[PDB]
Amino acid sequence: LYSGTPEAVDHQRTQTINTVGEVNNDWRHRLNTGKAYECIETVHGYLMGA
Amino acid sequence: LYSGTPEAVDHQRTQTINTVGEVNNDWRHRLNTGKAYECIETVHGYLMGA
Amino acid sequence: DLNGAGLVASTPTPQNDAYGLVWAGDTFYPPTRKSVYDKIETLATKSGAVLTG
Amino acid sequence: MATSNVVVSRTGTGWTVDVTACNLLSDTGIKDFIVLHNAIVVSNVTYAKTTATTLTYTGAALPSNTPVEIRRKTPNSIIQLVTYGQKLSSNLWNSEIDRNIRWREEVDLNGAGLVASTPTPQNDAYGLVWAGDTFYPPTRKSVYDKIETLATKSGAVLTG
Amino acid sequence: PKTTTFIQLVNKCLENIGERPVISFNNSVARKAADTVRDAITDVSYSYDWSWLTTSIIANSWINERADLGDVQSVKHVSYGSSSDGYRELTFTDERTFDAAKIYPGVGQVFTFNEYGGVRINPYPETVEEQVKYKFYVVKEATLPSVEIDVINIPDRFIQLITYNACTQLSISHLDDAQASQMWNSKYIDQLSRLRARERNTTQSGANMFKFRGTR
Amino acid sequence: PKTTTFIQLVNKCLENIGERPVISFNNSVARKAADTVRDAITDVSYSYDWSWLTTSIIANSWINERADLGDVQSVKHVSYGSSSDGYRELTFTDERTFDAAKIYPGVGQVFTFNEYGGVRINPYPETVEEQVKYKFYVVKEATLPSVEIDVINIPDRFIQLITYNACTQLSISHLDDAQASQMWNSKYIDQLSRLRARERNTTQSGANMFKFRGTR
Amino acid sequence: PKTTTFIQLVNKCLENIGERPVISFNNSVARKAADTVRDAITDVSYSYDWSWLTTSIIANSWINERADLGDVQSVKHVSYGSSSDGYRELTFTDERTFDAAKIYPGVGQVFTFNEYGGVRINPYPETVEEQVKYKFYVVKEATLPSVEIDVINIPDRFIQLITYNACTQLSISHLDDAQASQMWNSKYIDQLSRLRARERNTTQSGANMFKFRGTR
Amino acid sequence: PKTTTFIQLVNKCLENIGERPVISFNNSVARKAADTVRDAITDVSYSYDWSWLTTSIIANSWINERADLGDVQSVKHVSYGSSSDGYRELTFTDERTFDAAKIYPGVGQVFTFNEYGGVRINPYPETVEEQVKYKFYVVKEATLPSVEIDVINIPDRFIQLITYNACTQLSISHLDDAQASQMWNSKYIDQLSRLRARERNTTQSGANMFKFRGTR
Amino acid sequence: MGLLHQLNIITNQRCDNLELAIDEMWTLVQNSSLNPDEVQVAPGKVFLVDSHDDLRPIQRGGNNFVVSYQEAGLLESTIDRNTGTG
Amino acid sequence: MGLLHQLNIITNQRCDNLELAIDEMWTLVQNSSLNPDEVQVAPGKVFLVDSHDDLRPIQRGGNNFVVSYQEAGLLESTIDRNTGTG
Amino acid sequence: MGLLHQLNIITNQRCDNLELAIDEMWTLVQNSSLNPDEVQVAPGKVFLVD
């Protein structure tokens, strides 16, 4: 989730049955929003500064 | 993505299947928004100033 | 088309008649490969024959 | 109408031959031709009459530059029987007379059936090579070789 | 399968419209019925892109850049290649844009329609080995029978549709009965509507609004 | 069960339209009734995806990469495997995309429709042991009886629907009575509507807008 | 193919309207049927831009700047050049704008319509070698047969449509039967609508609202 | 081409309406048919701006400022000049504004209409060499034939439209049959609508809502 | 993790439907004058036809994209409001 | 990277559809008086016709470009928010 | 650079369409009283028609 790559998205789509449940995730769009990346990076920056 | 040229756009379109997925990217418009260019240049300017 | 025409010597020509009674007493007409093959396809072999019926 | 033998050379399979010089019958249902692969006649079932002027090969892949040679051979068959009360068909009369002309022209250009080639005993292994051969009588050697692998009706000693 | 003959179809249409069975097309009733059945076969062929009419063929003959496909209802796509190498689709262009470029021998890139039954391909093939490498996705015309013993090149399970159409036309022609013509036409329209709604060229799971033209 | 015979159905239709029951198809009315019954059976088969028509079969015969399924109304799905190992569904592709790839022997991944009653599968099987592992989800055509003592391959609880349709067509053909044809058609349509509303291939609890296509 | 004769089409129309087939246009009904068939052929030609009517030709004869195309339904486009060099399309201008410029020999740049069957091109060619370099995209008229044994220059699969139109006109003229005329007109209109919907001059893949006119 | 004669057109109209053929206009039926055919020719000429009626001509005769154009349906544009120098179009003004200026010899700048068949041009030409330099864009009247052997100055592919109109009027006059008149009128209207929709005086590519007048 | 995966799924589904919901399409009905090779977009082009309803734009239905955007915004707000990066 | 590619794809698709969605087009039906060479725009021009409905402008359908603009804005906001250039 | 080209193209296309979308036109149908020479715009003009 943190790293945004086609391979990381491929790995993400294999964990949605366990995490979200029985939902469809065979979309032909394979985009990642980078939300986890930005959250981790913001917390990391604040923690480094503190 | 950083550089905006017709050749750069042609190369970007060759990576659409890998990056976005099985989507149509054969539009007759070859426009680039320069979003990556401005992001890189803005961060470069702030980093140089710091 | 089967025998020709004219006053020419009666040299033999392979006949494509189906297997049967025309096949006895010829003594100078050879068969055709199709005519032989059609009959041979309906015969059992000495080794590894798969009898049916 | 005047016919002429077409001599071509093709490699492989799935190709086409223009037989406008042969000038076959308009009806594609009638297969009025004979094929001579490398100067020996072969079965024409592999040649599909796509149109009256084009033949299509769908058989086994031929060697490089095989001298494929097509002739015209009008079948000896009646177009239609006229019955009691049937209208006289000028088209049918013309068609029968034309077929007679076709056969006469073929017998004048080439021979008449027998001399399409020289019937010589062919020493080929028993298999799909004969498979519809209306020519070229088999060799006694090949016939003997195939018959020895055949069981008898009386006193047969089966093996295997 | 394809086991229904022209005389049997004519007799079925005649007995459906109310005439006696016939043994040959020697009388005017059977002659008109045969003409009507041929017309009905052509009309049913025009009614839909049937699976027994859609096929992939090669060109019957070639002029320098024009390939003649004989008598086909329409040409859908043109492809180049072989089955062991794959088929590449050619791009369709109108006649004016097609004529704007030089016509030279080579490997086909674009194609257009020229008059009746002909497709012009540029660049064009010059040898038979290259000509036989072009696949044409066409819709064939229905083969019309000519004599009594001719077997109709149509599956036996559309013979009732052909019979309904031929009976509509025979009610118009032989009987001049508008009510019977309308009744047979209603039968034919219902049958054709259900057949077209149920038998399509794609599956329901494959029927999608998205097609992947390749990123360019 | 399936105990109704062709002569019994013909006699029922004749008795309903007002003709005397027969013991053989010897006269014109019995012959017309037999043909009408065959047409009505085909019509009823085309009216719906009946449970007595939906089935899973293997291909009748194989050409190199084309499997012939005989005469079936439609092909829904294709699967590979066995019952002891499970069945994997193949993805349908149109003919142009199917022809764009090389055709080589192997385990089937995609399939398409070729001409009438044929499915092209790529990769294709080359041995009978591999060919018998392909399951085709098809809708069969109705088996039409040929002689008097032939048992109709249809359950006896649809024989009255077939009789209504045959009586509609017989009122069209024999009686030439538009009003009687309309009444018979109303009966047939009402019963068919109830049968199609009550008889579906999924249960009410299983009828859902959601299907799980697994996280590709 | 194009194997239908004028006498055969006339006999078909006569049989459809209820008259005995003839062997020559000797009686009044045969003459009326021949005239009606010619009128129906012209009507079907006017009905659509058929592929057997659309073609590219050169001018029959030239006056100084006016190329005479004889009889054509319409002229769509004009091009200059050869097949080995390509064709450049000329720009159409109205007659007043065309006459506003000097008319001098040269290579064609603009064209307009002059009276019936004539196209004025400016600049105009003065030699035959330059005149033969002009391609006209026209829609031809249907060739009307003149005698009994003339072969109609129309494919055999449109003969039924021509027959339906001729039968409508013959019901109007000979039979004076409005109901039969309406029935034949319904048949003709239905098949014409399906033919025009299915057989177009561009493919579905090529049907697009975008045309590339190049960056002047 | 123009090969149809007046007697042949009269005979076709008579055979279509149900009359016997004639050899000359010696009897009342042929006289009335000839009058009806002339009326139908005039009506069809009024129906549309046909390409065989539109032309560019010079004035038949000149009075001081008024040029007589004979019998023309309408005058569209007036131009001055030659083909070797180009044509400049004159500006149309109403009669009141035209009369507001002095009428003196010179080179034409404005024009107006003067009762029937006359155009007043100011300034006007005084010599024949100046008069022959004025081009009038007019729509001609249909030339009506007078005797049996007169060739009708209409292309042969509109003769059937003329026949439909003449048959409508003949059903009105000779037969007084409203139903037949309505059917013939329907035929004529359908064909005229298709002809006007397909055969226009501009191309589709040139059909633009923008015209370049000037920058003054 | 569940909220992040749901946000990604919503974004991908919305992209799939949006890629199909943008294109403008026209419908041409058979006629006698307007051929498919003459229907092109030009400024001020006049179509020479026999009926005004031969060429007609396709009317697309109401799209449910506002609910997808609202859910995506709610998911992003929930993720930030759980993480503490306000 | 995926967001940048998606933004480029959305911009290109929107431009492709917009190039066709702008032009003004008319439709002329066959008649007896109004020829297609007379139908041109002029200030105060009077069309001499036989029926008021011979010439009609083409009515375009509802354009789905607002959703494309919303998605482009959302993608740009997401890219700026991920990069840190607020 | 591509954006500048697209802006110029859009401006030119909009200008071409707007030049045609401005002019006001009228339609006169054949009748017995109102002639095309007398249909002019005047303040308070009354049209004598049928």
Automatic annotation (TrEMBL), chains A, B:
This is Portal protein. It comes from Anabaena phage A-4L. The chain holds residues 52 to 101 of 653 of the full protein.
TrEMBL record, chain D:
It comes from the Viruses. This is Tail fiber protein. It comes from Anabaena phage A-4L. The lineage of its organism: Viruses, Duplodnaviria, Heunggongvirae, Uroviricota, Caudoviricetes.
Automatic annotation (TrEMBL), chains E, F, G, H:
It comes from the Viruses. This is Tail tubular protein A. It comes from Anabaena phage A-4L. Pfam families: SU10_adaptor. InterPro entries: SU10_adaptor.
Automatic annotation (TrEMBL), chain K:
It comes from the Viruses. This is Portal protein.
